[PDB]
Amino acid sequence: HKLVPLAPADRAPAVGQFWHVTDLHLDPTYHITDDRTKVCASSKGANASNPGPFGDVLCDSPYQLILSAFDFIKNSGQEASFMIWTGDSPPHVPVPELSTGTVIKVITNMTMTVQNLFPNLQVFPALGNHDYWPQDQLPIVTSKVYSAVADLWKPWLGEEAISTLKKGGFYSQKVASNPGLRIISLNTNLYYGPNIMTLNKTDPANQFEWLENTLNSSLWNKEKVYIIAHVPVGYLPYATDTPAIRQYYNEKLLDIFRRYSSVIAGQFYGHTHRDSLMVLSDKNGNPLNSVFVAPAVTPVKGVLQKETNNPGVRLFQYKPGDYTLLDMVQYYLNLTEANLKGESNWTLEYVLTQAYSVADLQPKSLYALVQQFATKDSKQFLKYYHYYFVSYDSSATCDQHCKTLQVCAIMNLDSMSYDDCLKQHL
């Protein structure tokens, strides 16, 4: 007779789950036509290779492809308490074929697609480098795009997040359904090489100072943080000695992350359109923080590229009220199969713990996995390289130089450790 909360059962608490989708790159021009140079503006005059209703490898995403991905999520049977969405909604077309109003129109379409299909789902977006006109020129003060997305994303974000988003394209937000968890959505496009607006700025839009203060508050309030952004930290795995953002910013951002590794329970990025792992470590090789780069929904590649990705979306599992990452489930669309019969079959690609025989996604568990990759003829690395392209090409091979570049980028996010890895393994 005293109104005490009702105790749950002795059952095991169910894991928490969240979706990650990225790099949708809608091409509204997509349409099948005899002259394959007119199928999609994003092929920039090249002949689409073998186009179908769900797209083509030389094209960005038809609306039907993006719809099939979100329909899959909706009907998947997976419970999820939120979704992260790390940017890049307009297609790859020349700057004069876009405008601020066109960019805002595509972002609106994608946002409203999500809000219409998932009316009760909190979504945490980040801006990508194509989410601005002209592309990559994301500014260090308020702008029409920043104001537009602050209005579009208001259903998901509190007043403070809306205020920082409008001013600089970044925010942090407590997760309604997960007390003790905070999402930090960075604008890492401010650090991206092509951005003229941030040349020679030590702290563009004051995001480093803001990030430092946010993480410090999280540390003292005993919160855990998931970092999300479009462009990742670290090195490109397919090129030699090339940081994904400007070296000065990569070093500075990584030092913040190392200092707050006890608070940061995950980092999630897009932009590369590939499935990649990174493990942030200290100078002595001790693992500190796990990093997950998710592949894109668009399958687009340039004519000069041999390989591309299949469309992908992914799901993370985490410990409730604790937020340690337990697993990752990668789903994909076999685009050639879907196009041939005209019906999509989004399906499981792999479960990380099962594919690699690891216990969970903690930095030490993944560090031990990537150490296996480094062994000669590692079957684990061969599997990883197949998944890097989301199973696009089972016959794709990675020679000695290719593999050194991959493994060095997985394990060494800062310049000193990366260059030392090259010294040892080139």
Ligand X SMILES: Nc1ncnc2c1ncn2[C@@H]1O[C@H](COP(=O)(O)CP(=O)(O)O)[C@@H](O)[C@H]1O
Ligand Y SMILES: *[C@@H]1O[C@H](CO)[C@@H](O[C@@H]2O[C@H](CO)[C@@H](O[C@@H]3O[C@H](CO[C@H]4O[C@H](CO)[C@@H](O)[C@H](O)[C@@H]4O)[C@@H](O)[C@H](O[C@H]4O[C@H](CO)[C@@H](O)[C@H](O)[C@@H]4O)[C@@H]3O)[C@H](O)[C@H]2NC(C)=O)[C@H](O)[C@H]1NC(C)=O
Ligand Z SMILES: *[C@@H]1O[C@H](CO[C@@H]2O[C@@H](C)[C@@H](O)[C@@H](O)[C@@H]2O)[C@@H](O[C@@H]2O[C@H](CO)[C@@H](O)[C@H](O)[C@H]2NC(C)=O)[C@H](O)[C@H]1NC(C)=O
Ligand U SMILES: *[C@@H]1O[C@H](CO)[C@@H](O[C@@H]2O[C@H](CO)[C@@H](O)[C@H](O)[C@H]2NC(C)=O)[C@H](O)[C@H]1NC(C)=O
Binding residues for ATP are 92, 129-130, 238
DSSP string, 370-425: HHHHTSTT-HHHHHHHHHHTTTS-TT----HHHHHHHHHHHH--SHHHHHHHHHHH
When asked if residue 49 is in the footprint of ligand Y (CB under 6 A), the reply is no
When asked if residue 34 is in the footprint of ligand Z (CB under 6 A), the reply is no
Q: Which of residues 235-294 bind ligand X (CB under 6 A)?
A: 238, 271
CA angle 14, 296, 26 (to 5 degrees): 115
Q: Which of residues 385-414 bind ligand Y (CB under 6 A)?
A: 391
Task: State the binding string over 97-136 for ligand U (x if CB under 6 A, else -).
Answer: ------------x--xx-----------------------
Alpha-carbon distance 213 to 230, whole Å? 21
Task: State the binding string over 18-37 for ligand U (x if CB under 6 A, else -).
Answer: ----------x---------
User: Which residue, 112 or 141, has its beta carbon nearer to ligand U?
Assistant: 112
Which of 27, 56, 88, 349: binder of ligand X (CB under 6 A)? 88
Alpha-carbon distance 130 to 103, whole Å? 8
Task: State the binding string over 125-154 for ligand X (x if CB under 6 A, else -).
Answer: ----xx------------------------
User: Which residue, 56, 32, 28, is CA-closest to 43?
Assistant: 56
Q: Which residue has the tokens 């997305």?
A: 149
Contact 381, 373 (CB under 8 A): yes
Report cis status (omega within 30 of 0) of the bond before 134.
yes
User: Which residue, 28 or 134, has its beta carbon nearer to ligand U?
Assistant: 28
Which of 224, 271, 314, 403: binder of Zn ion (CB under 5 A)? 271
When asked if residue 78 is in the footprint of ligand U (CB under 6 A), the reply is no
Contact partner at residue 159 from ligand Z, Zn ion, ligand Y, none, CB < 5 to 8 Å by partner kind: none
Contact 345, 338 (CB under 8 A): yes
> Could you tell me the smallest distance in angstroms from the CB atom of residue 331 to ligand Y?
13
User: How many binding residues for ligand X (CB under 6 A)?
Assistant: 9
Which of 29, 47, 147, 261: binder of ligand Z (CB under 6 A)? 47
When asked if residue 206 is in the footprint of ligand Z (CB under 6 A), the reply is no
Contact 195, 189 (CB under 8 A): yes
> Could you tell me the smallest distance in angstroms from the CB atom of residue 382 to ligand Y?
14
Start-to-end Cα distance in the chain: 73
Alpha-carbon distance 189 to 127, whole Å? 8
DSSP string, 330-358: EEE--HHHHHHHT----EEEEEHHHHHT-
**Piece in contact with ligand Y (CB under 6 A), picked from 69-77, 189-197, 269-277, 330-338:** 330-338
Q: Which two tokens stand for residue 239?
A: 């090129």
> Could you tell me the smallest distance in angstroms from the CB atom of residue 394 to ligand Y?
6
> Could you tell me the smallest distance in angstroms from the CB atom of residue 34 to ligand Z?
9
> Could you tell me the smallest distance in angstroms from the CB atom of residue 60 to ligand U?
13
- Give the residue ranges of the annotated binding site: 23, 25, 88, 92, 129-130, 230, 238, 271, 273
Give residue 93's identity as a one-letter amino acid code: V
> Could you tell me the smallest distance in angstroms from the CB atom of residue 192 to ligand X?
8
User: Which residue, 168 or 270, has its beta carbon nearer to Zn ion?
Assistant: 270
Which of 3, 79, 220, 394: binder of ligand Z (CB under 6 A)? 220
User: Which residue, 293, 371, 290, 359, is CA-closest to 326?
Assistant: 359
Residues 6+ apart with CB under 8 A from 214: 172, 182, 184
> Could you tell me the smallest distance in angstroms from the CB atom of residue 96 to ligand X?
17
Contact partner at residue 386 from ligand Z, ligand X, Zn ion, none, CB < 5 to 8 Å by partner kind: none
Q: What's the Cα-to-Cα distance from 185 to each of 11, 174, 227, 248, 372, rounded to whole Å?
A: 34, 11, 6, 20, 32
CA angle 294, 350, 11 (to 5 degrees): 100
Beta strands in 58-97 (DSSP E): 82-85
Q: Which residues bind ligand U (CB under 6 A)?
A: 28, 63-64, 109, 112-113
